[PDB]
Amino acid sequence: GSAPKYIEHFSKFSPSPLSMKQFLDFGACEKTSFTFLRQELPVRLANIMKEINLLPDRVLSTPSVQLVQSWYVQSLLDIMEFLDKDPEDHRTLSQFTDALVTIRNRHNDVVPTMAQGVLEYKDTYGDDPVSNQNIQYFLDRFYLSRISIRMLINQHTLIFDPKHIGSIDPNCNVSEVVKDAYDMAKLLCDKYYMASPDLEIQEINAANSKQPIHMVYVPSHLYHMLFELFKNAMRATVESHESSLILPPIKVMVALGEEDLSIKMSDRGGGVPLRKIERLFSYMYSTAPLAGFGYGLPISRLYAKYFQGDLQLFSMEGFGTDAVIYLKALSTDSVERLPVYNKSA
């Protein structure tokens, strides 16, 4: 077999970041998506596969890594089939879509699979800060790459099976998605705890204080992030108050500025000492109910970063925690953030 040759070839190429605009202007032909993706997925697969291969043998040799390395290989080979093939042939196109869906399914379990390798490494080699930064360095890049690939595939499979453009809503109502995520977190919270804090949403449209706040975004991504933040904020409010009688609401502010769309989630759950914040974003130190232990925070932070956003926690121990999602607001500033293989190895 030739996998290491292909990995070599395509890891010479750079992933090509797309903007929201570019993603909408595919709402262009299917032939164009096909010829784009049969180049670009190999480039993006190979770039990460190359980085996996740089991991020390004691990590690389583990079953978890070998297993997802084997998925990445099959998936690269699956797309090779189509490199010679003819876009004009409508059956090349429908077989390609078959092929992407198969690939997407194959990769569904990477997160907990890679999680299992983190746990194995913790017990096998220990949990020193240097182990921590390396796992954090590696997985932020790996998971961000994974997000970027799922985005491409979904965009194709959802368009080439009109208002939403695949996973993108050009008129995304932010408050609508906040409530959706709230309602769902409340459901689970009431289940496990038989009480839930209430929601208050305030909006601030600086430039247009009347108009409700719409953006171009990928709502599932925003949902993912708000869901995780609600779960945390509900767990924290409820547990800090099981003696007490009142449950303070969770307050969400949605601010639209010239360049930032900011979503703050303010809970009154007794907060986190500054010392313990960074650990909350750590894959290693969050590996072992509603919320309490999982990869929600770090991965929610990646979804934010993916379109040049961010996601920050600021607490006040004894008072509560502010979680802020920062997004771009303008589709022009909303460009893929990709980890690229190069010098910095």
Ligand X SMILES: CC(C)c1ccc(COc2ccc(CC(=O)NCCN)cc2Cl)cc1
Ligand Y SMILES: COc1cc2c(cc1OC)[C@H](c1cccnc1)N(C(=O)c1ccc(O)cc1O)CC2
Q: Phi and psi at residue 251, in whole multiples of 5°? A: -110, 125
Distance from C-alpha of 253 to C-alpha of 27, rounded to nearest angstrom: 32
Nearer to ligand X, 119 or 316 (CB): 119
**Shortest CB 93 distance to ligand X, Å:** 36
Q: Was 205 annotated as part of a binding site? A: no
Task: Please tell me whether residue 272 binds ligand Y under the rule CB under 6 A.
Answer: yes
Q: Was 119 annotated as part of a binding site? A: no
Number of residues that bind Mg ion (CB under 5 A): 2
Task: Please tell me whether residue 118 binds ligand X under the rule CB under 6 A.
Answer: yes
Q: Was 286 annotated as part of a binding site? A: yes
**Shortest CB 120 distance to ligand X, Å:** 7
Q: Are 201 and 156 in contact (CB under 8 A)?
A: no
* Nearest CA among 301, 302, 296, 290 for reference residue 324: 301
Q: Is 246 exposed, middle or buried (0-12, 13-18, 19+ CB in 10 A)?
A: exposed
Task: Please tell me whether residue 333 binds ligand Y under the rule CB under 6 A.
Answer: no
Name residue, tokens 């313990």.
276
Q: Are 188 and 231 in contact (CB under 8 A)?
A: yes
**Shortest CB 265 distance to Mg ion, Å:** 13
| Among 18-26, 119-127, 148-156, 263-271, the segment contacting ligand Y (CB under 6 A) | 263-271
From the list 55, 67, 99, 111, which residue makes contact with ligand X (rule: CB under 6 A)? 55
Distance from C-alpha of 289 to C-alpha of 299, rounded to nearest angstrom: 19
Coil, strand or helix at 97: helix
Name residue, tokens 């997925």.
41
Distance from C-alpha of 247 to C-alpha of 71, rounded to nearest angstrom: 46
Task: Please tell me whether residue 72 binds ligand X under the rule CB under 6 A.
Answer: no
Q: Is 228 one of the catalytic residues? A: yes
Q: Is 231 one of the catalytic residues? A: yes
Q: Are 166 and 159 in contact (CB under 8 A)?
A: yes
From the list 135, 159, 225, 323, which residue makes contact with ligand X (rule: CB under 6 A)? 135
**Residue 215, token pair as written in the block:** 């953006």
Site for ligand Y in 204-233 (CB under 6 A): 229, 232-233
From the list 6, 26, 72, 121, which residue makes contact with ligand X (rule: CB under 6 A)? 121
**Residue 256, token pair as written in the block:** 């639209």
Q: Are 28 and 37 in contact (CB under 8 A)?
A: no
Helix (DSSP H) and strand (DSSP E) numbers for the chain: 12, 7
Partner that binds at residue 80, options ligand Y, Mg ion, ligand X, none, CB closer than 5 to 8 Å by kind = none
| Among 2-10, 163-171, 309-317, 320-328, the segment contacting Mg ion (CB under 5 A) | 309-317
Under the rule (CB under 6 A), what is the footprint of ligand X?
A: 55-56, 59, 64-65, 114, 117-118, 121, 130-131, 134-135, 138-139
Catalytic (active-site) positions? 224, 228, 231-232
Under the rule (CB under 6 A), what is the footprint of ligand Y?
A: 229, 232-233, 236, 239-240, 267, 269-272, 276, 280, 313, 315, 321, 323
